[PDB]
Symmetry: C3
Subunit: 104 residues, 3 copies
Amino acid sequence: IEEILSKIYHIENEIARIKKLIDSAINNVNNNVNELANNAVKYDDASKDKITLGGGATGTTITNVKDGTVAQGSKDAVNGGQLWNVQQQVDQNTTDISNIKNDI
Amino acid sequence: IEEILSKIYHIENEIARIKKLIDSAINNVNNNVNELANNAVKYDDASKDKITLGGGATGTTITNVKDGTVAQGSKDAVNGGQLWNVQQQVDQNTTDISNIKNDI
Amino acid sequence: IEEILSKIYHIENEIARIKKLIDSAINNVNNNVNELANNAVKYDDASKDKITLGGGATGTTITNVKDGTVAQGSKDAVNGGQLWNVQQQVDQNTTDISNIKNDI
Ligand SMILES: [Cl-]
């Protein structure tokens, strides 16, 4: 009988240990999920047809974008250095056009 | 003894409570993980060298993109208003070129 | 009494079953969270003002980008086919400018 009572005491202790484990394990996983929920970039809905970036009214800079292929129908994103290359050629054309005209 | 039996009854009840807690806590965390898994934008593999957006064959619009720096070697993404500014200058050049030629 | 002892034995077995459940359920959820943590595209901090893509020093290609609206102030990302269309018009202008000049 004093054996029964001791066995019950240990059972009670193990139940308490289990409750402590559940609470710590669940808190840990919820903490990790919460962190990701708050920092993941998300599609706006299940269509995945749009990502409205989360930076607010002044927007979100995306950077470390590798140069996209500039070819007909390419769906790769392009970056500021790619646009700068075009801008340089356009500025030359604008200048040359002005130079030709002012030569008259 | 009737004490032992009562203690056992309560132990049984607590075990059932614990099983109910585990099931609810795990369901909650799985629900939150599932939601994020389905709406997070993902890299295609562990290299992180590419994101193929999930909008299907007609693609994914990214919007609220802050103007990227247009400078040599910039890796910032650029947006449609930045391209529109270039397009405007190109259209002027095209027109002026046509005007110069038709002046002959 | 032999009833008490049997009830205790079953209680012990159920506690072990519960410990096995907790360990499997938690491992499963941690595995799914870990996978997402490693493949989700993330904002750099709580401002969400920037995403520095995770592809390393040579960057990350974003693809399957739907054509963005090219209009004044548009914050839609643009893609390589959109840039290619502009490049084509710029190359024409450059050529025509050279042709006009070499006609002299
Ligand atoms: Cl031009």
